[PDB]
Amino acid sequence: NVEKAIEALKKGEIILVYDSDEREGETDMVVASQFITPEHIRIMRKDAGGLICTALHPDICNKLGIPFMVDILEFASQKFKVLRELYPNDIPYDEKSSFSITINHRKTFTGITDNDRAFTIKKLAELVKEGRFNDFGKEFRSPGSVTLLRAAEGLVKNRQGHTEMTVALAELANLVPITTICEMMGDDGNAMSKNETKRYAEKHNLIYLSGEEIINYYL
Amino acid sequence: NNVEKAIEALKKGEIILVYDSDEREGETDMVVASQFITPEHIRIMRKDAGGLICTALHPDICNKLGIPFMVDILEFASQKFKVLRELYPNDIPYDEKSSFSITINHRKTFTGITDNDRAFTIKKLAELVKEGRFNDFGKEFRSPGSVTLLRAAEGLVKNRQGHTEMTVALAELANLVPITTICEMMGDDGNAMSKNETKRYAEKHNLIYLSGEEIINYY
Numbered sequence: 001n002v003e004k005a006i007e008a009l010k011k012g013e014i015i016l017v018y019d020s021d022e023r024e025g026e027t028d029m030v031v032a033s034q035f036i037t038p039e040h041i042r043i044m045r046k047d048a049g050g051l052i053c054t055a056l057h058p059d060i061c062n063k064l065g066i067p068f069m070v071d072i073l074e075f076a077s078q079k080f081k082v083l084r085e086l087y088p089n090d091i092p093y094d095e096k097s098s099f100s101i102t103i104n105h106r107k108t109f110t111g112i113t114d115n116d117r118a119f120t121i122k123k124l125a126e127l128v129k130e131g132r133f134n135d136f137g138k139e140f141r142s143p144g145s146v147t148l149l150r151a152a153e154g155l156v157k158n159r160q161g162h163t164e165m166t167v168a169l170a171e172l173a174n175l176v177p178i179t180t181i182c183e184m185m186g187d188d189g190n191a192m193s194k195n196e197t198k199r200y201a202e203k204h205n206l207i208y209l210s211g212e213e214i215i216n217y218y219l
Numbered sequence: 220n221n222v223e224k225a226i227e228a229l230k231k232g233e234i235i236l237v238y239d240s241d242e243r244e245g246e247t248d249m250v251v252a253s254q255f256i257t258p259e260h261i262r263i264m265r266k267d268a269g270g271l272i273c274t275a276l277h278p279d280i281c282n283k284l285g286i287p288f289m290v291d292i293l294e295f296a297s298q299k300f301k302v303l304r305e306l307y308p309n310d311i312p313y314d315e316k317s318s319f320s321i322t323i324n325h326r327k328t329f330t331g332i333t334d335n336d337r338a339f340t341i342k343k344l345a346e347l348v349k350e351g352r353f354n355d356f357g358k359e360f361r362s363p364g365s366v367t368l369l370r371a372a373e374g375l376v377k378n379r380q381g382h383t384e385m386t387v388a389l390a391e392l393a394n395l396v397p398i399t400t401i402c403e404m405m406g407d408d409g410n411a412m413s414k415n416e417t418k419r420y421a422e423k424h425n426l427i428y429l430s431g432e433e434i435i436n437y438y
């Protein structure tokens with residue numbers, strides 16, 4: 001199943017990845033960022049509905065100098081004390097946020113359109129694939145509409161969220177290890193259930209993958 | 220006229236549409252008074268508008284809670300994270316500054332992104348403010364989260380004319396807690412939904428549609 005998903009990812013398709021019954025119980029739509037298109041963004045906002053985020057392998061984040069947002073906030077809590085009052089000291093270690101900074105490519109206008117978000121994401125994957133790390137500040141500004149996620153060092157060995165699972169899948173596919181993901185939201189106000197997301201994958205001829213399978217394959 | 224009609228709609232917990240200006244973003248946001256937000260509002264915003272779902276706060280509330288602008292958090296944190304300096308938004312194309320602030324989740328939510336979770340976070344924030352329980356902010360919320368806050372400029376539309384200021388101004392005029400939730404309407408072609416298409420939406424759904432100039436002049 002993992003290898004079939006890898007082929008789909010290599011063709012620029014959206015695949016569906018469920019994490020686990022014990023974790024978020026959520027399914028994310030996932031695409032290899034180097035193949036992102038405005039159409040992928042349109043499908044994610046209409047049929048998934050969560051935040052459209054782009055996850056990056058830790059090696060990439062280290063080359064760009066991008067930290068976890070929690071660390072930006074903790075340091076800034078020295079000046080803005082409310083940040084200390086909002087510390088996420090109550091989240092299980094396994095669910096600790098993978099949130100990093102938000103960005104827009106400088107050539108975009110408001111940054112939120114399908115065209116703007118696909119351009120921001122595709123240009124970031126381009127810059128990374130080409131190794132033009134120093135061009136990051138030249139080409140992008142923060143804050144913006146595309147939320148970046150920082151994958152755990154060691155990926156699924158140390159954290160088992162969609163952030164790590166999808167980046168691990170891109171690494172396995174021999175692609176730039178950067179993915180764009182969006183949580184699938186249900187009409188009942190909760191996340192779409194695994195039965196509901198498997199159903200959507202069947203209707204749209206998409207690959208549906210369980211996180212356990214990616215983890216096992218990777219390890 | 221239409222502004223008074225939009226005010227009555229907000230007081231009833233309905234959504235209104237606000238277009239800023241041809242000379243600014245050229246975008247229409249769906250708008251609702253946060254104290255009346257429901258999971259259904261979040262659902263219609265993600266399916267029918269599609270941009271980010273953000274909650275704008277009157278600067279008075281922001282000062283009482285100690286919530287700063289995000290660019291300021293980044294500016295201060297750049298002392299430690301050098302990448303932040305190179306990402307300065309000294310070039311946002313449609314205004315001097317962004318209204319982006321911190322992101323939050325109410326501590327009682329699970330993943331924070333569902334319609335139920337986002338509506339709960341936003342409504343609870345509006346309630347905490349309405350009840351003057353500012354010392355309870357950290358007790359009830361954590362950052363980062365799925366709900367992005369926006370800080371309205373001091374003087375509102377007298378000093379900045381974004382949807383952030385315009386909508387907070389309408390909530391104030393309505394004698395409501397001045398906190399709004401807004402979402403940009405996106406088009407199928409990859410650009411923001413056109414003025415003509417957002418008008419057709421407003422006519423189909425009998426929603427009040429306002430332009431920025433009318434709100435600014437009335438305020």
Ligand SMILES: O=C(CO)[C@H](O)[C@H](O)COP(=O)(O)O
Binds near residue numbers: 095161181
């Ligand atoms: O938080 C999220 C996006 O903002 C989603 O849960 C997304 O799937 C990435 O997070 P995680 O790695 O915890 O699954």
Ligand SMILES: O=C(CO)[C@H](O)[C@H](O)COP(=O)(O)O
Binds near residue numbers: 314318380384403
């Ligand atoms: O940026 C945005 C959301 O994050 C949107 O533009 C929203 O309408 C608020 O911004 P502004 O006050 O500039 O119109």
Ligand SMILES: [Ca+2]
Binds near residue numbers: 097098161330
């Ligand atoms: Ca998560």
Ligand SMILES: [Ca+2]
Binds near residue numbers: 110381
């Ligand atoms: Ca804006």
Ligand SMILES: [Ca+2]
Binds near residue numbers: 314315378379380
């Ligand atoms: Ca201005």
Ligand SMILES: [Ca+2]
Binds near residue numbers: 421422423424425
């Ligand atoms: Ca009508």
Ligand SMILES: [Zn+2]
Binds near residue numbers: 026162
């Ligand atoms: Zn997830």
Ligand SMILES: [Zn+2]
Binds near residue numbers: 244246248
């Ligand atoms: Zn706007």
Ligand SMILES: [Zn+2]
Binds near residue numbers: 423424425
């Ligand atoms: Zn209707």
